[PDB]
Design a protein around this ligand. Structure first.
Ligand SMILES: Nc1nc2c(ncn2[C@@H]2O[C@H](COP(=O)(O)OP(=O)(O)O)[C@@H](O)[C@H]2O)c(=O)[nH]1
Ligand SMILES: Nc1nc2c(ncn2[C@@H]2O[C@H](COP(=O)(O)OP(=O)(O)O)[C@@H](O)[C@H]2O)c(=O)[nH]1
Ligand SMILES: [Fe+3]
Ligand SMILES: [Fe+3]
Ligand SMILES: [Fe+3]
Ligand SMILES: [Fe+3]
Ligand SMILES: [Mg+2]
Ligand SMILES: [Mg+2]
Ligand SMILES: [Mg+2]
Ligand SMILES: [Mg+2]
Lengths: 195, 195
């Protein structure tokens, strides 16, 4: 059960999240919970750790900038983090709010949430499952989500590769700054697109 | 005259380059020489340093992988350079071959050639002129070269921004590794696209 990792039941958690997140965002988290379970079954990852990390991954999506800045100071995180914003913060810094609220201390689950947006050069299979689940969950409708879904049915690594390449491409298309850890993921995984 | 910086005349240099480079590549270098002069006039850069750096920028385009690897060892350059290829090497490492052949020691000209492909987070106006001249020279015909030309008529910084964003975008589109210094340039300049 989820209470093996956090300080409340799944139902209690959903009630809490429903007050923290807009409906669309909670529906997304439920989609990621389901997609993570499916991916974990396929690729040999603990389904429960995957489901819980999937449900929790966007728990901190709505924290204020000021809240994130307070957390960076309090936990003495990389000071360069203050040069970024919610996109980087909600996973990389938001894990500390999840930990405070829910008594989440499992290192694997925390790491998977931490890097769910940007990835890393080295990712555990759990990390990859969350990173991909987030992108392919049933409620997502962006062009090429179908390609991502097909790839994810066959290869976890290639699915990470596809997502990271499409993300870097779109960030540059839009003219948005690219977090250096995002590039680390990109350069580590892009070769799988030849797979 | 060019002999103020190198060990031969412009005519002698062209004769040498014609044996080192395919016709198309030498024509490109001549295009960059001209474009660099125009940009330097517009943006307050020494026209002669610009023209010479423009002509020379792709001098090392055709060196073998083995030649580049020898230069990396000989000059004890960043050992990470061995993980890359001609795209990174021809400017970043090729400057040493230019220096050996032509007795080029001018630090400003060398730096502008060095970073002409990838840029840097901090670029001199000469660096920017070469970086942009390369992209917009008259022989270039790629989609959106017209946009780059228009921007370059107005703002050197915005032209760097446009080129770097389009390059990162295309590298991710194609699935090619992105050199970390390229990202440094991208993150430093992308804000100018709001200009
Ligand atoms: N500026 C910036 N945004 C990024 C980067 N990587 C991902 N993002 C964006 O962060 C946003 C949230 O991403 P993610 O956490 O994966 O999905 P979500 O929380 O379900 O929307 C998206 O718009 C991504 O494109 C980056 O390196 N830089
Ligand atoms: N793999 C890779 N290629 C790059 C990077 N930056 C630029 N290039 C490519 O290097 C090639 C040569 O670039 P450049 O020196 O600017 O132009 P050229 O020498 O006149 O063709 C082009 O195909 C660029 O897209 C990078 O970060 N990684
Ligand atoms: Fe997220
Ligand atoms: Fe999400
Ligand atoms: Fe070049
Ligand atoms: Fe060139
Ligand atoms: Mg994040
Ligand atoms: Mg993250
Ligand atoms: Mg180069
Ligand atoms: Mg270069």
């Amino acid at each position: 059960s989820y209470q093996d990792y956090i300080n409340c039941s799944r139902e209690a958690l959903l009630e809490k999240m429903a007050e923290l997140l807009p409906e669309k965002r909670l529906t997304h988290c439920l989609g990621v919970e389901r997609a993570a379970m499916e991916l974990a079954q396929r690729f040999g990852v603990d389904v429960e750790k995957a489901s819980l990390a999937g449900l929790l991954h966007d728990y901190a999506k709505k924290l204020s900038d000021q809240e994130f800045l307070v957390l960076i100071d309090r936990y003495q995180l990389d000071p360069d983090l203050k040069n970024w914003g919610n996109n980087v913060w909600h996973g990389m810094v938001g894990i500390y709010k999840i930990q405070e609220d829910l008594d989440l201390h499992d290192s694997e689950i925390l790491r998977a949430i931490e890097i769910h947006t940007v990835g890393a050069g080295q990712m555990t299979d759990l990390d990859k499952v969350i990173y991909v689940a987030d992108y392919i969950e049933h409620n997502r409708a962006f062009p090429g989500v179908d390609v991502a879904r097909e790839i994810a049915s066959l290869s976890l690594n290639k699915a990470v590769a596809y997502e990271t390449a499409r993300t870097v491409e779109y960030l540059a298309h839009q003219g948005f700054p690219i977090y250096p850890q995002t590039l680390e993921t990109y350069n580590a995984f892009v070769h799988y697109l030849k797979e």
